Design a binder for this molecule. Structure first.
Ligand SMILES: [K+]
Ligand SMILES: [K+]
Ligand SMILES: [K+]
Ligand SMILES: [K+]
Ligand SMILES: [K+]
Ligand SMILES: [K+]
Ligand SMILES: [K+]
Ligand SMILES: [Mg+2]
Ligand SMILES: [Mg+2]
Ligand SMILES: [Mg+2]
Ligand SMILES: [Mg+2]
Ligand SMILES: [Mg+2]
Ligand SMILES: [Mg+2]
Ligand SMILES: [Mg+2]
Ligand SMILES: [Mg+2]
Ligand SMILES: [Mg+2]
Ligand SMILES: [Mg+2]
Ligand SMILES: [Mg+2]
Ligand SMILES: [Mg+2]
Ligand SMILES: [Mg+2]
Ligand SMILES: [Mg+2]
Ligand SMILES: [Mg+2]
Ligand SMILES: [Mg+2]
Ligand SMILES: [Mg+2]
Ligand SMILES: [Mg+2]
Ligand SMILES: [Mg+2]
Ligand SMILES: [Mg+2]
Ligand SMILES: [Mg+2]
Ligand SMILES: [Mg+2]
Ligand SMILES: [Mg+2]
Ligand SMILES: [Mg+2]
Ligand SMILES: [Mg+2]
Ligand SMILES: [Mg+2]
Ligand SMILES: [Mg+2]
Ligand SMILES: [Mg+2]
Ligand SMILES: [Mg+2]
Ligand SMILES: [Mg+2]
Ligand SMILES: [Mg+2]
Ligand SMILES: [Mg+2]
Ligand SMILES: [Mg+2]
Ligand SMILES: [Mg+2]
Ligand SMILES: [Mg+2]
Ligand SMILES: [Mg+2]
Ligand SMILES: [Mg+2]
Ligand SMILES: [Mg+2]
Ligand SMILES: [Mg+2]
Ligand code: NA
Ligand code: NA
Ligand code: NA
Ligand code: NA
Ligand code: NA
Ligand code: NA
Lengths: 95, 48, 57, 103, 128
RNA sequence: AACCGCGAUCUCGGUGAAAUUGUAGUAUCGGUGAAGAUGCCGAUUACCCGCAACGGGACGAAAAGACCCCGUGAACCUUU
RNA sequence: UGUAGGUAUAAGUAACGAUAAAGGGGGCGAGAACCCCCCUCGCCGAAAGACCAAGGUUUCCUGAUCAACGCUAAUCGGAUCAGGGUUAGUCGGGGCCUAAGGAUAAGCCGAAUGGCGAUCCGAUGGAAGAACCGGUUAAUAUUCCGGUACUGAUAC
RNA sequence: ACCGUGAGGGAAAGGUGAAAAGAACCUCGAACAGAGGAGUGCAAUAGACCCUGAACCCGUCUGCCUACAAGCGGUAGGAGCGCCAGGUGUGACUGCGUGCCUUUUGCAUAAUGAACCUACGAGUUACUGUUUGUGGCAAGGUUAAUUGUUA
RNA sequence: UAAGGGCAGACGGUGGAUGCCUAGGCUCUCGGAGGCGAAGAAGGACGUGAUAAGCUGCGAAAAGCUGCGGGAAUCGGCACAUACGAAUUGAUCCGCAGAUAUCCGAAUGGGGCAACCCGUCAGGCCCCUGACACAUGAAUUUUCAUGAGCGAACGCGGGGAACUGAAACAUCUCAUUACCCGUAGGAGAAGAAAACAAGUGAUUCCCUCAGUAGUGGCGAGCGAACGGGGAU
């Protein structure tokens, strides 16, 4: 339930091309590494070897109305880089 | 030259923070007045 | 130091009498049939006094 | 509030440029109290070739519902409607001009 | 019907005028007016040369406005203009909306800066 | 006192404030006058419009004089 | 010397913020003194180079944009919009300890609100349980990878 | 929003059209930057800052005057010229004329005050007295609080 | 000859006056109601949409979940959106009753720079997560009940100015006002004669008595009661 979406980007594509056991997810900001490992294992039926995390504060943005400007903000999130055991894989395109 | 405002987050919170206001009867008076006026920023704790 | 009075529209316009944009000194170059500044290179053909000065490919 | 017309009803325009013309109701905008009557109140819209090639498109614009009256099934005329529970305990619309149940 | 009749009269009148307009040009009306006074009343081809080689910055926009006016004349008369046929029969520069800015001055004072705009109108016609 | 260099200055292109401001086609002299006149009187002088330069006047601008007096004003200080 | 808004006058005037300084050739572009590349010139060099902390908070990198902002213009920007970007058992902090001081217990004082008063809180100090070498991105690296190691708990 | 360490202080900002029908397409231009068209619409000089659209302030055109002339800029006379049938614009030349407010014995005053325009801005209300104009009753006049009916 | 200038008319520009318009204020009337909170408040933080959330709603069940009643064709909140779905086997919506309801905050397991850090005991998982319990103080006999905090005015109580007026000022006035603090209720306070008076018969409020009796550097000012008429 803590996994929100995966990370698709040029950096993640290069990382997966160079490793093939490394994937990225956007998770809830308050989940720890053990919780992330358990959620990933339950969701994909794999063996997780390592989890790296970084916390991202949401970007401040400008909401434009007819009158003028309102200062707003995007939601904060946490990035989880998950490395699996050798030979394992996860498919994002399938299903 | 040195100006009057020399920022320090620790001093700012120790002097004007929410817990500093709640620790005193007159600080709670300030909080009640600000709530009655309807301020969106109750204390310096609300700012970032 | 300070104007004792504001200037009237008449006084302002009278001073502005001599404010004018300058007309450029234009020659015709009857061969190419278009304007250019006298004593400069004709920028279209690249000629000057009937000689190719600047060649553009 | 329940309106005096509905989608699929035959209505007559009683006020405006299309006064005296009947048609079918295609959609009802309840908040604005307007309705689209098929074939009536045509407008020309200048549509950019964005699409998905542009051009001038003819389409129906909505009419205020106080300008529309249900067509009487007997005489084919605009009329005010009422409501009664004659249909097996259910409220139905009927035409005050004749009495027949609106359907 | 009153406003419809008035509009029809005005629409008929506009068919015999050949003009172009530049609106909300973000530059000084006075400096633009210098160029306008330079080219008022002048034959169109000479005016185009003068504006092309003028030493004022506003002449560049005036040149494109003049070209637009000549094109409007050509479309409304349904033919191309000949040599020396058209001349700048009217030209005016009006002031437009001002942007207001603040500039700091010594000892804590703040002064207002005005960034002015102008409109330009050009009418061409034949030297009849 | 002379000369020299650069920056400012002057001219051109671009951008573009401020203090000040009853309206002004705002000359000089001597008179007059709330007693020191661009503006009144009598004379005199003076074609229309700029630019550079200087500060005699506009009792030039600035902050409702701090000196002085006044108010049954105020504050602070002293003391038998 | 009234108030708000708008617009004048002075005026196309003062000024464009250190006198370290610029010249040329190519590129791109509708547009170039100023943008990008090259050559030459000049300035700092116990700094005007390189780091840590406070403070700031996305300003970082890329693609579009040149309206406004940038004391000029701009194709450029710390500007606008969108997307991306911060990876730790060993680095820093916290978890542990106490100083000034603060909050309190038993008690003391006091129209009220309360004022005091030895355990707790409280770093700017004391402990932390513990590495380096090399490579790699447009943007991270003692954190990712390849070696080489070490430390703490846990099941035999 | 902004300002302030903080307590706190504290704005400006409404209106297209009946309906978005919110301008397909063409022209000039690097570009809607902007405009001229076409089309929609009763109307676009209702085109997005959009109803009406004043003043100060800024322009263009047309008429008349103006480069030998000297003071609050008007006022009273008065040719010529120019427009449209006795009106209207201008004004050669002549006489007279030191703004206004306030404060003062007395101000052209070199005493005070104002850049200008639009908008805003200052003897009001209650109660109780008194005088008076006009009334009702009259050797009497008048109810207060409150109560009843329908309201 | 007009470089320029003056006046008038016409037509534009700027600017946003005026006219017209508005549910946004202001003052009231009548009838209710007069609290919310340890079963965790007021007020916030962070989240939550197919697509970023500025408001609104909602809370990991997150623009919503369940039941009963009403209703009958559209609905999926607003900031000039589309897609994609729901719905006559009755959506959406409306009334009533339920379910869920993160973190902070009296905040209550201990701390703390609000929205965080660290725990102990039992129980279910495997370093680490999910559901409990774990504050204090007056009553009660470990159990039980109450309290704490917030909040419009009106009530009661504890403290209590000054400018001002007296044409200075100290008694006096402003005023038992402003303000600070404590504490109730739908009202509160008062109330049933050791009373007023020179006959009445508990309190409270209204109209009079009356600017009267008194009081007072007898100055400025302050100012009743008995009686009578009512509400009850
Ligand atoms: K980390
Ligand atoms: K003054
Ligand atoms: K209109
Ligand atoms: K209208
Ligand atoms: K106008
Ligand atoms: K005259
Ligand atoms: K003076
Ligand atoms: Mg000049
Ligand atoms: Mg400009
Ligand atoms: Mg140039
Ligand atoms: Mg400064
Ligand atoms: Mg000079
Ligand atoms: Mg210049
Ligand atoms: Mg004299
Ligand atoms: Mg004299
Ligand atoms: Mg004078
Ligand atoms: Mg002076
Ligand atoms: Mg004085
Ligand atoms: Mg002044
Ligand atoms: Mg000057
Ligand atoms: Mg300067
Ligand atoms: Mg200069
Ligand atoms: Mg350095
Ligand atoms: Mg950058
Ligand atoms: Mg770029
Ligand atoms: Mg610029
Ligand atoms: Mg950028
Ligand atoms: Mg300790
Ligand atoms: Mg870096
Ligand atoms: Mg552009
Ligand atoms: Mg109109
Ligand atoms: Mg308008
Ligand atoms: Mg002479
Ligand atoms: Mg003459
Ligand atoms: Mg005197
Ligand atoms: Mg006099
Ligand atoms: Mg005076
Ligand atoms: Mg003055
Ligand atoms: Mg004066
Ligand atoms: Mg005035
Ligand atoms: Mg005024
Ligand atoms: Mg003229
Ligand atoms: Mg006008
Ligand atoms: Mg749940
Ligand atoms: Mg606690
Ligand atoms: Mg006194
Ligand atoms: Na640093
Ligand atoms: Na920091
Ligand atoms: Na157009
Ligand atoms: Na002034
Ligand atoms: Na002239
Ligand atoms: Na706690």
């Amino acid at each position: 339930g803590i996994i929100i979406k995966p990370i698709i980007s040029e950096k993640m594509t290069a990382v997966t091309e160079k490793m093939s056991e490394r994937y990225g997810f956007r998770v809830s900001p308050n989940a720890n590494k053990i919780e992330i490992k358990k959620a990933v294992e339950a969701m994909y039926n794999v063996k997780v070897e390592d989890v790296n995390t970084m916390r991202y504060d949401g970007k401040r943005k400008n909401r434009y109305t007819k009158s003028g400007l309102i200062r707003g903000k995007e939601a904060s999130f946490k990035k989880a880089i998950v490395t699996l055991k050798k030979g394992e894989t996860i498919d994002f395109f399938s299903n | 030259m040195k100006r009057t405002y020399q920022p320090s987050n620790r001093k700012r919170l120790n002097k004007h923070g929410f817990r500093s206001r709640m620790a005193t009867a007159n600080g709670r008076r300030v909080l009640a007045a600000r709530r009655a006026k309807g301020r969106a920023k109750l204390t310096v704790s609300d700012e970032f | 130091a300070h104007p004792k009075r504001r200037q009237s529209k008449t006084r302002t316009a009278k001073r502005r009498t001599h404010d004018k944009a300058v007309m450029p000194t234009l020659a015709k170059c009857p061969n190419c049939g278009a304007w250019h500044i006298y004593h400069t290179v004709c920028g279209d053909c690249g000629y000057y006094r009937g000689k190719l000065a600047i060649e553009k490919e | 509030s329940k309106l005096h017309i509905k989608k699929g009803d035959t209505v007559m325009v009683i006020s405006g440029e299309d006064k005296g013309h009947s048609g079918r109701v295609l959609e009802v905008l309840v908040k604005e109290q307007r309705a689209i009557v098929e074939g009536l109140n045509m407008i020309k819209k200048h549509a950019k070739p964005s699409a998905k090639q542009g051009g001038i498109i003819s389409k129906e614009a909505p009419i205020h519902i106080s300008n529309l009256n249900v067509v009487d099934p007997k005489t084919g005329k605009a009329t005010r409607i009422g409501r009664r529970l004659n249909e097996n305990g259910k409220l139905v619309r009927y035409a005050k001009k004749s009495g027949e149940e609106i359907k | 019907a009153r406003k419809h009749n008035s509009a029809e009269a005005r629409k008929e009148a506009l068919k015999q005028m050949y003009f172009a307009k530049l609106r909300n040009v973000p530059t000084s009306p006075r400096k633009m007016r210098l160029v306008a006074d330079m080219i008022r009343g002048m034959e169109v081809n000479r005016a185009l040369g003068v504006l092309k080689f003028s030493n004022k910055e506003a002449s560049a926009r005036v040149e494109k406005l003049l070209r637009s006016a000549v094109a409007n004349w050509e479309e409304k008369n349904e033919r191309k203009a000949e040599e020396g046929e058209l001349f700048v029969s009217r030209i005016c520069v009006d002031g437009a909306s001002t942007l207001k800015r603040l500039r700091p001055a010594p000892q804590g004072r703040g002064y207002r800066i005005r960034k002015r705009s102008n409109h330009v109108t050009i009418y061409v016609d034949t030297l009849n």
